[PDB]
Every structure is written in C-alpha cells, then in structure tokens.
Amino acid sequence: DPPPSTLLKDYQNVPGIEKVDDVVKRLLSLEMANKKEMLKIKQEQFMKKIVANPEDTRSLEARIIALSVKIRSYEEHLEKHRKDKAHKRYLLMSIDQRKKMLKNLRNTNYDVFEKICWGLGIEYTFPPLYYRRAHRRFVTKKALCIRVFQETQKLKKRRRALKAAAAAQKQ
Amino acid sequence: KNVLKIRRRKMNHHKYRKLVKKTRFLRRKVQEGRLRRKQIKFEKDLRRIWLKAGLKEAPEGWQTPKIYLRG
RNA sequence: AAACUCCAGUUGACACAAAAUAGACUACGAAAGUGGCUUUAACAUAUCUGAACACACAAUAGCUAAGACCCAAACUGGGAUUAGAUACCCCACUAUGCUUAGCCCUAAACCUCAACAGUUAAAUCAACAAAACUGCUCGCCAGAACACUACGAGCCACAGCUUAAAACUCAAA
RNA sequence: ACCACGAUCAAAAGGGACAAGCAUCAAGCACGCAGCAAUGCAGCUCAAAACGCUUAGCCUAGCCACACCCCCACGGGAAACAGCAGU
Numbered sequence A: 001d002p003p004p005s006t007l008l009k010d011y012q013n014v015p016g017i018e019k020v021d022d023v024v025k026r027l028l029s030l031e032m033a034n035k036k037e038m039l040k041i042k043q044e045q046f047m048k049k050i051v052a053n054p055e056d057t058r059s060l061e062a063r064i065i066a067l068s069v070k071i072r073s074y075e076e077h078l079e080k081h082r083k084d085k086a087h088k089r090y091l092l093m094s095i096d097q098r099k100k101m102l103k104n105l106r107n108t109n110y111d112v113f114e115k116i117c118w119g120l121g122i123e124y125t126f127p128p129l130y131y132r133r134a135h136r137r138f139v140t141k142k143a144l145c146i147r148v149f150q151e152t153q154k155l156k157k158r159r160r161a162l163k164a165a166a167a168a169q170k171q
Numbered sequence B: 001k002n003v004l005k006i007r008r009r010k011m012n013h014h015k016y017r018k019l020v021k022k023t024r025f026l027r028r029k030v031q032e033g034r035l036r037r038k039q040i041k042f043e044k045d046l047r048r049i050w051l052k053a054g055l056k057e058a059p060e061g062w063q064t065p066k067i068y069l070r071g
Numbered sequence C: 001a002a003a004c005u006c007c008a009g010u011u012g013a014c015a016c017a018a019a020a021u022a023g024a025c026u027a028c029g030a031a032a033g034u035g036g037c038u039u040u041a042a043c044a045u046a047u048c049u050g051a052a053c054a055c056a057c058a059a060u061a062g063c064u065a066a067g068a069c070c071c072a073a074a075c076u077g078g079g080a081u082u083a084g085a086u087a088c089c090c091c092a093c094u095a096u097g098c099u100u101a102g103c104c105c106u107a108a109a110c111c112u113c114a115a116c117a118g119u120u121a122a123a124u125c126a127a128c129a130a131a132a133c134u135g136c137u138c139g140c141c142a143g144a145a146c147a148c149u150a151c152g153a154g155c156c157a158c159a160g161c162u163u164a165a166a167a168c169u170c171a172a173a
Numbered sequence D: 001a002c003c004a005c006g007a008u009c010a011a012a013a014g015g016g017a018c019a020a021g022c023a024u025c026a027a028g029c030a031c032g033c034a035g036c037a038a039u040g041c042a043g044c045u046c047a048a049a050a051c052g053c054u055u056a057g058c059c060u061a062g063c064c065a066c067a068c069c070c071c072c073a074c075g076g077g078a079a080a081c082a083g084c085a086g087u
C-alpha cells in the first residue's frame, strides 16, 4: 500500500503543497482519509506503470486495472469478514468480469495483454472444457485407472529388457 | 382458481409420509442392503479395470475405499 | 374450572430478548431478505443472452456442539366443552425462536407474468386477470391419473433432498 | 488371344461419409503425440452426446450379411433342405 504520508490524488498537483505546515500535510494525506482514497492512489500507480496513455480511462487496459484494484479491496474485506456472503459474491463476479476482459484483450492486442499480466501479476488460465461434478465414485475410479496405467508401463519396460537379454544370448 | 389439484397432492404426500413412518425400520434394513451391493458393484468395476489391462492383482498399495458408508 | 397465593399495587435498581411513532414514505439488495443508534468496510461488469448438476447464495422449519433465556411456544400435562374431542377455549411447561461454529438446501421461494431491445399503428382483444404486440436468446411444456411415487445416480443429507419413469385404469381431466 | 506401361472391372490397404430409441448409459480408462532408433512428452475421446444398453437387414434396376452351432473353423460340439418338391 502507498505510505500514509502520501497526498490525496486531488491535492498532489496543487502549486505550493510542499511548503504548507506539517499539520496541513496530514489533513491532505491518506492517513486522514478513508480506504477508497488509498485505492485511487493504487490505481494511478498501475496506470503509469502499464498503460501507454495514463489519461485514457475507457480503454480495455484501464478497465482491467480499475477492476483489479476493486478485486484486491474485496479480498482484503473478506479476510476480515469471512461470513459476508454479499461481498463474496461481488468478488467472484469481479474475477469473472476481469477474466472476460483479459480474454478480449488477449484476442485483440496480445502485446498489451502481456504487459497487463506482468504489471498486475495475473496468471491467465484457460477455462475447463467440461463442467460436471467429480463425485466420489469418479474420483476413486480415475485414481485407480491412473495407477493401473503406471503399473502397465513398468511391466512393458520389463518385457523389453528380457527380450533384449535373450536376443543377445543367441549371438 | 380452486385448490382441488393441490388437495390431491396434499393427500398423496400425507399418505406417503405416513407410510414411510410406519415402515421406517424395514426401509432402514433395505437401504443397508442396497448400499452393500452398491459397494460390491463398485469394487467389481475397479477389479475389471486392472484385470483387463493385464495385471493379476490390484496396483501395489491400492485399497478400494468404502465410498458409500455414513462415516 | 384448573392454576398461583414468597401473590398483587406503587416506587427504585435492572437484558446474549424484541426494535411504537416516522411509514399517507416506496427506498436498498441477485434473490432470499432489509424499517432503534454510532462508526469501519462496502453494494461486479462501457454490448446482450448464457446452467436442476459447474461456481456462489438461498425465508421458516430441522440436525450436530457449546452458551444465553424476558417473552412466545410444537409436544406433553392439567382444566373445560362434546355422543366422542387425540381439536377449537383456559393454564403450565419443553424442543424451538437468540448467540457461536458447522450442516441441511426446501416454500403459494408467486408480483404463479424469463433476460435484453423496441412499439402504441394496424386485426385492440376467446374469458378472467394486471391493455395489445414486435425482434432476439436461453429455460420449459405436449390428455387425465398413477406421481413432490418406484428404480438408478449424486449429496456432511439415513423417516432426507435433487433428478424422475412404467404397468394396470378412464373418456375424460 | 499373346505384351497391352492402356482401358475395363474390382479386392486388400489409407482418407471421408453412413439407422432408430434411451442421458435414469456421463464420463471412457490408454482410448495420444514426437523420434531413424534408443527413448521422451502425457496426452487422446466426450452434453455439437464419447462410452454403453436395447431394437432393426438396408438408401430396393438392387445392395449387405449369413450358409447347423462355437463372431472365425486348425480344432471341437456334432452329423446339418435358410436349393427344388415334400414332411
């Protein structure tokens, strides 16, 4: 998070803000504001770091950054409010909306898609092909089928050496 | 609208709940028997897999769990 | 009538309960829900549609464990009524309603009216209800009853929930 | 006739296409790829219906399949009209 001494986004570009009293600097810093003012500072840092035009807010890049800041605020809220079902819904929906944005950005501007993933630390994932419950019977059988395959591969290798050894004895 | 269709369903449900309550000890013995055959049918399916693949016994260290018990 | 009679009235001290008036307002939330006060956090998405099962929720009742307990109150007990009264009426009291941590996953969960976009002209339109329509998409329906059932499958559910037939029967519903 | 570097006809092999009902059959369980090889990678099919069960000869100048049964027929069971007439 930005330091508490950081000035608000509105008072950071007023002339002479560095020569005011220390008390005036506290009243205009993040320490004396609500958390939403701190999120506007985080959003500004990501823009200058990632997007080419930090002033264009309607581009698909700015939207992914703005939504990524909201997602982080929901995660911090839920870390303290674990039974808040309403905000748990807002988090999961926001993550879905960002994935849809990333999908559209990956399809249209790959170079910008790579810089967004690096800048925000997002690990893009492709959706599953099928949506179906993995109940106990299936989970158990799938584990057994993988063990059976692993054991058959070992027996097929031990049938190569014996055949190779016997072939050399003929010579 | 009248509630004649609801009333037919109402009596059906009442008589069903009463039947289940009257025979809940027989049904509990039947349910137990079905879950056993269900576990056996599941063990046969896994055994069919490793036998058809050429193996003679279950893979080393495999134990078919009981996936239908209350525990 | 039973019940109480360490009962009742005034006065003072005094909640892990419930939130007159405002509200003739019609707001918030995806729905379920939300109307005492304060503060913190906080109410997704710059195209739309998109799921019984994926993902996350979901009144009341109910289950498991530990607490609180004013009042209410299934069950149960007592009183009365009655041909009988396992009720309706009166009294008492419990599970339960509350908190915490997990489950359960249902409703006439209905404003019985799907989401989005558009129209008020033409034929306005079976009836009633809350006027009649267009485009587009998803979901769903095809006589009644059997059937919120049987079987199978899944599920922390073991008298449960979800999905859900057929045979016999009728010429109606 | 015989060769036909051909035509006609048409197997095997490779690619593609090709019935119905049931999803209360929802997962299949090795079903892929690379490499000259050694071997390496962990993939392949599937609600646009895989896998499975049940029904049925078909798309009729005709075609397919079968030919007592064990899909086949060395072998075995056994001793064969689903050729015509006939019982």
Ligand SMILES: NC(=O)c1ccc[n+]([C@@H]2O[C@H](COP(=O)([O-])OP(=O)(O)OC[C@H]3O[C@@H](n4cnc5c(N)ncnc54)[C@H](O)[C@@H]3O)[C@@H](O)[C@H]2O)c1
Pocket (backbone or CB within 6 Å): A129, A130, A131, A132, A133, C051, C053, C054, D047
């Ligand atoms: N089954 C899948 O996971 C899957 C995959 C690709 C596309 N779809 C699409 O989903 C729609 C519903 O398919 P169905 O009729 O076979 O489903 P269905 O309702 O019969 O459900 C069968 C399975 O698919 C899942 N499913 C249901 N609706 C889905 C949806 N909208 N998207 C993804 N999965 C869904 C269910 O959870 C279940 O596992 C169709 O439009 C289909 O093209 C489904």
Ligand SMILES: [K+]
Pocket (backbone or CB within 6 Å): C019, C036
């Ligand atoms: K109040």
Ligand SMILES: [K+]
Pocket (backbone or CB within 6 Å): none
């Ligand atoms: K319902």
Ligand SMILES: [K+]
Pocket (backbone or CB within 6 Å): C108, C110
């Ligand atoms: K209603």
Ligand SMILES: [K+]
Pocket (backbone or CB within 6 Å): none
């Ligand atoms: K044959």
Ligand SMILES: [Mg+2]
Pocket (backbone or CB within 6 Å): B001
């Ligand atoms: Mg009426």
Ligand SMILES: [Mg+2]
Pocket (backbone or CB within 6 Å): B008, B011, B012
């Ligand atoms: Mg009935």
Ligand SMILES: [Mg+2]
Pocket (backbone or CB within 6 Å): C023
């Ligand atoms: Mg009022």
Ligand SMILES: [Mg+2]
Pocket (backbone or CB within 6 Å): C050
């Ligand atoms: Mg949508």
Ligand SMILES: [Mg+2]
Pocket (backbone or CB within 6 Å): C051
């Ligand atoms: Mg569906």
Ligand SMILES: [Mg+2]
Pocket (backbone or CB within 6 Å): C052
């Ligand atoms: Mg449901």
Ligand SMILES: [Mg+2]
Pocket (backbone or CB within 6 Å): C058
């Ligand atoms: Mg609930």
Ligand SMILES: [Mg+2]
Pocket (backbone or CB within 6 Å): none
């Ligand atoms: Mg409770």
Ligand SMILES: [Mg+2]
Pocket (backbone or CB within 6 Å): none
């Ligand atoms: Mg009381």
Ligand SMILES: [Mg+2]
Pocket (backbone or CB within 6 Å): none
């Ligand atoms: Mg109590």
Ligand SMILES: [Mg+2]
Pocket (backbone or CB within 6 Å): C098
């Ligand atoms: Mg309270």
